[PDB]
Amino acid sequence: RRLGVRAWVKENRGSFQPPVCNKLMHQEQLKVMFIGGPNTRKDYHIEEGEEVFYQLEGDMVLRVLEQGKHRDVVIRQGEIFLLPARVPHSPQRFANTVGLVVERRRLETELDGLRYYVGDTMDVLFEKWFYCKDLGTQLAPIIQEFFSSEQYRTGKPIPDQLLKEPPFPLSTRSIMEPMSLDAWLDSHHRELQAGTPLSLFGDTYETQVIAYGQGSSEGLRQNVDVWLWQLEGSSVVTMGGRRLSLAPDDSLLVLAGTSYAWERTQGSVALSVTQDPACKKPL
Ligand SMILES: [Zn+2]
Numbered sequence: 001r002r003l004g005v006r007a008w009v010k011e012n013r014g015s016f017q018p019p020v021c022n023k024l025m026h027q028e029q030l031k032v033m034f035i036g037g038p039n040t041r042k043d044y045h046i047e048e049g050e051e052v053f054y055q056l057e058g059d060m061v062l063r064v065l066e067q068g069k070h071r072d073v074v075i076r077q078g079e080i081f082l083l084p085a086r087v088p089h090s091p092q093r094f095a096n097t098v099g100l101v102v103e104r105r106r107l108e109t110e111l112d113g114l115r116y117y118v119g120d121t122m123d124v125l126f127e128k129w130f131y132c133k134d135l136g137t138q139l140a141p142i143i144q145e146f147f148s149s150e151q152y153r154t155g156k157p158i159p160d161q162l163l164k165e166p167p168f169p170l171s172t173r174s175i176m177e178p179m180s181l182d183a184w185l186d187s188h189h190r191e192l193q194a195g196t197p198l199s200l201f202g203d204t205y206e207t208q209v210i211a212y213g214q215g216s217s218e219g220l221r222q223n224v225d226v227w228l229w230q231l232e233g234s235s236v237v238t239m240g241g242r243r244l245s246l247a248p249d250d251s252l253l254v255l256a257g258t259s260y261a262w263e264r265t266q267g268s269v270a271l272s273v274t275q276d277p278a279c280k281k282p283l
Pocket of ligand 1: 046047051
């Protein structure tokens with residue numbers, strides 16, 4: 001069950017380049033995916049859940065539509081960033097890079113969208129909305145459809161092929177600045193090692209990425225998955241009658257409906273990643 005993150009990336013190296021630049025490490029309630037390049041594109045993904053971006057190897061550019069403006073969000077190696085719900089985003093990836101993206105299984109009620117815009121404007125050229133189960137797989141025919149369309153050929157939209165309005169309001173939020181994960185962890189070393197687990201992004205998001213130093217934790221049975229990633233030092237997770245030693249860079253997925261006990265050593269640093277749909281933000 002324990003997976004060394006860079007060891008898993010090495011074993012699956014060939015997956016992080018064209019034609020399919022991604023491989024899911026975990027694919028149940030929590031989608032833990034690793035993506036490579038090159039992949040330069042104009043499609044904008046829209047979803048009701050949030051997306052955690054971390055650059056393991058090399059840099060990437062996340063193009064976003066923020067408060068009526070086009071913005072390029074540069075995410076450098078070692079940087080972490082959280083995208084809120086319903087923000088249109090277009091990830092740009094380069095050769096020999098590896099990024100981690102964390103997203104969640106959609107609720108039966110949630111719709112995903114894919115949009116292409118007219119030139120550099122906010123006018124929609126082409127769009128398709130769908131119920132997402134396996135994103136990359138469902139996106140491929142929509143993209144092929146776009147490249148075969150009158151819309152792509154002419155650069156002009158077909159009004160009858162556009163929705164009157166999106167199925168939900170698009171985000172009105174200001175987009176955060178990506179931050180160095182290591183710099184953030186070192187700056188909060190005193191609070192972390194005093195036994196205070198800390199949320200990287202706070203309570204205004206559904207997602208909870210929490211940093212832990214030395215201490216004890218009890219994981220209760222939840223209807224959501226939890227991904228643990230040991231960054232520095234070691235810890236021990238007691239789960240399903242087994243004691244699993246997490247060495248530096250080891251990760252463990254705690255499946256929904258499983259309880260655990262976590263014992264972290266002095267000077268150790270680890271993360272937990274949770275995207276509980278019950279924590280979805282209103283408005
Ligand atoms: Zn996305």
